[PDB]
Amino acid sequence: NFLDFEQPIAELEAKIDSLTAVSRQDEKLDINIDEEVHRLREKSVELTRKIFADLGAWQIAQLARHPQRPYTLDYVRLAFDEFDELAGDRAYADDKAIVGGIARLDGRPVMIIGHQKGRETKEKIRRNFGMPAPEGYRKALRLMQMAERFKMPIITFIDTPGAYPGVGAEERGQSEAIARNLREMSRLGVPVVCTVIGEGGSGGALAIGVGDKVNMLQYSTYSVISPEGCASILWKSADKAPLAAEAMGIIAPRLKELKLIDSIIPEPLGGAHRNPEAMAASLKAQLLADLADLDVLSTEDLKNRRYQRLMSYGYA
Amino acid sequence: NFLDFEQPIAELEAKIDSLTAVSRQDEKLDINIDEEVHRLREKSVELTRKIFADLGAWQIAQLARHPQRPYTLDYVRLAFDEFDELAGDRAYADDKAIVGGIARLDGRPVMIIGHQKGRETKEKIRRNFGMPAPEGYRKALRLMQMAERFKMPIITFIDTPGAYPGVGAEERGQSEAIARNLREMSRLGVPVVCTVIGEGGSGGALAIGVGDKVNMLQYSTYSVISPEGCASILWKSADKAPLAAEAMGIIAPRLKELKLIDSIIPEPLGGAHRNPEAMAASLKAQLLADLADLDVLSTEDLKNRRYQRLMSYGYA
Amino acid sequence: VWTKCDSCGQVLYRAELERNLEVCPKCDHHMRMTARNRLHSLLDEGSLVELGSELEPKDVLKFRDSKKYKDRLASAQKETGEKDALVVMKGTLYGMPVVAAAFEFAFMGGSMGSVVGARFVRAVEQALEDNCPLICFSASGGARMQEALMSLMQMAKTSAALAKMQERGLPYISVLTDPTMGGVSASFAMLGDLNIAEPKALIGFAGPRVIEQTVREKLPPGFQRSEFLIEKGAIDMIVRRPEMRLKLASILAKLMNLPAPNP
Amino acid sequence: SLMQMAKTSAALAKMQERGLPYISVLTDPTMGGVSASFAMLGDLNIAEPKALIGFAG
Numbered sequence: 001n002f003l004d005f006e007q008p009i010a011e012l013e014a015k016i017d018s019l020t021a022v023s024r025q026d027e028k029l030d031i032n033i034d035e036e037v038h039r040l041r042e043k044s045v046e047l048t049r050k051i052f053a054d055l056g057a058w059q060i061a062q063l064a065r066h067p068q069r070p071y072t073l074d075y076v077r078l079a080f081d082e083f084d085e086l087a088g089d090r091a092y093a094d095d096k097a098i099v100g101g102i103a104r105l106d107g108r109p110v111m112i113i114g115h116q117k118g119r120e121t122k123e124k125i126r127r128n129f130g131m132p133a134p135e136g137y138r139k140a141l142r143l144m145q146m147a148e149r150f151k152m153p154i155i156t157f158i159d160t161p162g163a164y165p166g167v168g169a170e171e172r173g174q175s176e177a178i179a180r181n182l183r184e185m186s187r188l189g190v191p192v193v194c195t196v197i198g199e200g201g202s203g204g205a206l207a208i209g210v211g212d213k214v215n216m217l218q219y220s221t222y223s224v225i226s227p228e229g230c231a232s233i234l235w236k237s238a239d240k241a242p243l244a245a246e247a248m249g250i251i252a253p254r255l256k257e258l259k260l261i262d263s264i265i266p267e268p269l270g271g272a273h274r275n276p277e278a279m280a281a282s283l284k285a286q287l288l289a290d291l292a293d294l295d296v297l298s299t300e301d302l303k304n305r306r307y308q309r310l311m312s313y314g315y316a
Numbered sequence: 317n318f319l320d321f322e323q324p325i326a327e328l329e330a331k332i333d334s335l336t337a338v339s340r341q342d343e344k345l346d347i348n349i350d351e352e353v354h355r356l357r358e359k360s361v362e363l364t365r366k367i368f369a370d371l372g373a374w375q376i377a378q379l380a381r382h383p384q385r386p387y388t389l390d391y392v393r394l395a396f397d398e399f400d401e402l403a404g405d406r407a408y409a410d411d412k413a414i415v416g417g418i419a420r421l422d423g424r425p426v427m428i429i430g431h432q433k434g435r436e437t438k439e440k441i442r443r444n445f446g447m448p449a450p451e452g453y454r455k456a457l458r459l460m461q462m463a464e465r466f467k468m469p470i471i472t473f474i475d476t477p478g479a480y481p482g483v484g485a486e487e488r489g490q491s492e493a494i495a496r497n498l499r500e501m502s503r504l505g506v507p508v509v510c511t512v513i514g515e516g517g518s519g520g521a522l523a524i525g526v527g528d529k530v531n532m533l534q535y536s537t538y539s540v541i542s543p544e545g546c547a548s549i550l551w552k553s554a555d556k557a558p559l560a561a562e563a564m565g566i567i568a569p570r571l572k573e574l575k576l577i578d579s580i581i582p583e584p585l586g587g588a589h590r591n592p593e594a595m596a597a598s599l600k601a602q603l604l605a606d607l608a609d610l611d612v613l614s615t616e617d618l619k620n621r622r623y624q625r626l627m628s629y630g631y632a
Numbered sequence: 633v634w635t636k637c638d639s640c641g642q643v644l645y646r647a648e649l650e651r652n653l654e655v656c657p658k659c660d661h662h663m664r665m666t667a668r669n670r671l672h673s674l675l676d677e678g679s680l681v682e683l684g685s686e687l688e689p690k691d692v693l694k695f696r697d698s699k700k701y702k703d704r705l706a707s708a709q710k711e712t713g714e715k716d717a718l719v720v721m722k723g724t725l726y727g728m729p730v731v732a733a734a735f736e737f738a739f740m741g742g743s744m745g746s747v748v749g750a751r752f753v754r755a756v757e758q759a760l761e762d763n764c765p766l767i768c769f770s771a772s773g774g775a776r777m778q779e780a781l782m783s784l785m786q787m788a789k790t791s792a793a794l795a796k797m798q799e800r801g802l803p804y805i806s807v808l809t810d811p812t813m814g815g816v817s818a819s820f821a822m823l824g825d826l827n828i829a830e831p832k833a834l835i836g837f838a839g840p841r842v843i844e845q846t847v848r849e850k851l852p853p854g855f856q857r858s859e860f861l862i863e864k865g866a867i868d869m870i871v872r873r874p875e876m877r878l879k880l881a882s883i884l885a886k887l888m889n890l891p892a893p894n895p
Numbered sequence: 896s897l898m899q900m901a902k903t904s905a906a907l908a909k910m911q912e913r914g915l916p917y918i919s920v921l922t923d924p925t926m927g928g929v930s931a932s933f934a935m936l937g938d939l940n941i942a943e944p945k946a947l948i949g950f951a952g
């Protein structure tokens with residue numbers, strides 16, 4: 001299900017699939033069909049290149065919510081091996097919105113914490129559409145403490161609308177869970193590398209995003225509040241979301257020049273949905289580079305650098 | 317409401333009240349009535365002395381459950397000043413069964429954690445009859461960690477039937493709460509003084525009773541399981557509780573000779589319920605004595621002594 | 633040589649069941665496994681070294697409820713062949729030195745007594761002096777009632793040993809078998825870094841009967857089972873017994889930064 | 896604004912490891928990122944009566 005503005009791209013892909021089926025059906029007209037496929041393949045590449053030349057903030061925000069996109073589990077599958085998933089915060093329940101575990105990154109063992117929106121509607125309602133209850137942030141804190149105990153680096157994926165604003169979730173100290181996560185994550189004695197694949201924000205994303213290195217995909221957003229909410233409160237309307245997205249500056253290049261994130265990971269043409277394998281490979285290379293240049297620093301120097309990075313946020 | 321075997325004492329007290337009323341009625345016979353009151357007071361004292369000469373294990377257990385007895389709040393009121401009560405584990409709820417706070421012990425600030433059964437039936441059902449949910453042991457751990465942060469000694473009162481065996485309490489990790497309390501309490505860098513006023517055991521009492529100095533009142537019980545349960549499992553009956561109580565050895569002098577507790581605090585004649593003020597004064601003196609010889613030790617030496625004491629439990 | 637699975641009422645061939653690690657090949661029901669056999673299956677071949685074999689029950693309380701406690705100890709020792717419930721056996725796991733412990737549920741219900749805590753502390757000390765993971769397979773009905781507080785205080789002692797291990801930074805994986813209730817679930821069984829649990833294992837603090845007596849209602853379906861706990865967060869993961877060895881080896885290799893074990 | 900939560904929490908961690916107390920008083924209203932950054936992070940969380948405290952409106 002492509003977005004509204006990607007309909008031409010969808011039509012070309014649909015035509016290619018139809019032609020492939022027709023070619024498999026017959027044998028005496030293979031040459032012409034193959035020639036048309038090659039011509040249409042070149043057309044699709046150029047069309048995707050020209051459309052994406054100038055994308056507004058709202059276009060990027062819509063892309064970050066594309067209902068076909070690699071989530072935390074997909075990245076784990078395509079870039080990590082020997083993944084053992086740990087479930088449970090030990091107090092109330094295990095939140096399916098956050099998936100955590102320990103796996104190997106090119107032999108090196110790492111701890112993986114990130115949100116999981118879910119692919120279909122069943123998983124989407126099972127995982128609360130990637131919105132974690134406080135028992136999810138408590139599980140994340142438990143896993144981070146475990147990783148810091150066994151001298152283990154931590155890798156975090158940030159893809160969630162935000163914290164769940166439910167009655168049950170609010171009774172169990174959502175604010176306390178987020179605050180404890182933020183406080184404890186600045187003292188970890190192991191490097192933390194956080195990426196913002198997909199959509200993140202509202203403060204329920206920063207709860208696992210206080211890291212030594214902050215990365216963001218080219219077409220990913222990271223805001224204090226969803227554009228819809230900002231429009232509703234300030235513009236007094238919900239349809240003026242694109243203006244709010246443009247004004248806030250939720251796009252990766254806008255944040256980079258503010259010294260808020262460390263690097264941007266380029267995505268395959270047409271977004272990370274076209275070639276998830278390439279996106280996973282690029283993310284893995286960036287993670288390896290960040291760990292390579294993070295291990296040189298000592299634990300005390302690493303913590304001091306992290307603290308100084310935090311104190312440099314804002315213009316004051 | 318005195319126990320079954322203390323009926324003569326109740327009758328004597330009623331007679332004393334009647335004599336007081338009669339004295340208030342008239343004026344020309346006050347001297348003789350006062351003399352009779354004094355004689356009956358001496359009679360009551362001697363009768364209490366002779367009755368308590370030989371009390372069995374079941375008698376002691378019944379005394380420890382007297383429905384008129386100073387609880388944690390009473391001891392705090394009669395031996396501590398400036399008591400500020402802290403409520404909440406920050407996660408699920410604040411358990412009324414455990415009352416915690418920070419107060420002053422002869423000027424010195426201390427942290428107080430203990431169970432509160434409640435006086436009447438309303439408070440008994442509000443406080444779950446002194447049986448704490450896991451959110452009570454989590455509050456206890458939070459308070460103990462706070463006290464250890466601000467170089468503060470910890471005082472614990474152990475008066476509870478045991479952990480609440482409810483469905484809700486079992487779903488929220490009762491075992492995990494108790495285990496975490498036991499593990500964290502052996503590393504505290506501040507002296508911990510634990511007393512076993514009233515009834516404690518089942519492991520939900522040891523969750524706040526791993527201390528440098530363990531004290532117990534003369535008429536208090538401390539067992540791995542209530543005598544009723546031991547009788548039900550082993551004797552195959554519930555009415556044979558006294559035999560189980562005698563066999564287990566749940567009485568303070570019996571436990572002392574096993575090198576399981578450090579000292580026994582003698583109680584006022586007729587139990588701690590007759591004269592709670594004297595009991596509170598004796599407990600305060602014992603606490604001050606225990607703290608006096610614990611402050612000399614360094615933090616590392618205090619922790620080493622605590623660890624070695626734990627490893628000496630049992631014959632193996 | 634023809635046993636039966638009670639859960640499904642089959643006629644499983646005994647050797648077939650034994651070579652599958654006491655798991656019914658039909659309904660995958662995890663039945664009783666002796667501590668020594670479990671440790672032999674877990675650890676490598678020819679590297680087993682039992683620890684704390686010099687510790688024996690030494691009843692001092694002279695307990696007598698309906699049978700002499702010494703008679704109970706002798707009967708359990710004759711039936712099971714082990715001095716007390718817990719059995720410690722140092723060994724190697726895929727070339728990785730490790731210390732493992734296993735409960736023996738046939739010894740007075742796997743209750744925790746003084747010798748159990750002493751042997752657990754011996755295992756912890758051995759792991760500490762030679763830095764290596766600790767693995768525990770908890771199968772206990774609670775704390776030994778015939779030892780009174782001398783069993784209750786074993787919770788604090790084992791917890792303190794685990795605290796020392798955590799300070800040193802060593803892993804400690806607690807495998808929760810069926811059943812693990814009472815003072816073992818509340819002291820060191822649920823105190824591990826990863827609380828792995830076997831399928832359909834009765835885990836909790838208080839038994840179902842006392843809970844029913846207090847509530848006087850119907851317990852939720854599948855109460856206190858492993859599958860019910862993992863949804864409540866008390867269990868980190870569920871691992872089948874035939875897959876336990878490799879899963880534990882991989883987990884401990886990842887935690888200790890060792891190379892992955894060869895399958 | 897969002898990154899200020901991490902900054903304040905890190906400062907509070909620094910003062911906590913020293914042993915200095917930090918009492919947080921919650922007044923009507925204490926919502927949003929303040930409730931999730933340092934308002935709900937003090938050693939004592941004191942709230943005035945009938946104060947609106949939470950994370951989401």
Ligand SMILES: CC(=O)SCCNC(=O)CCNC(=O)[C@H](O)C(C)(C)COP(=O)(O)OP(=O)(O)OC[C@H]1O[C@@H](n2cnc3c(N)ncnc32)[C@H](O)[C@@H]1OP(=O)(O)O
Pocket residue numbers: 518540541549740741742743772773774775776777778811812813814815834837838839840
């Ligand atoms: C307070 C404590 O910590 S001890 C209290 C007893 N335990 C509990 O309350 C928790 C669980 N309660 C139980 O009854 C069981 O452990 C359950 C629920 C797991 C049931 O498991 P079952 O298959 O029924 O095992 P069962 O209880 O029969 O145990 C087998 C044997 O161990 C004995 N046993 C088990 N735990 C203990 C113990 N703590 N002390 C003494 N004996 C014990 C039983 O008496 C029984 O002996 P028997 O068969 O010769 O009569």
Ligand SMILES: [Zn+2]
Pocket residue numbers: 637638639640641642656657658659660661
């Ligand atoms: Zn079967």
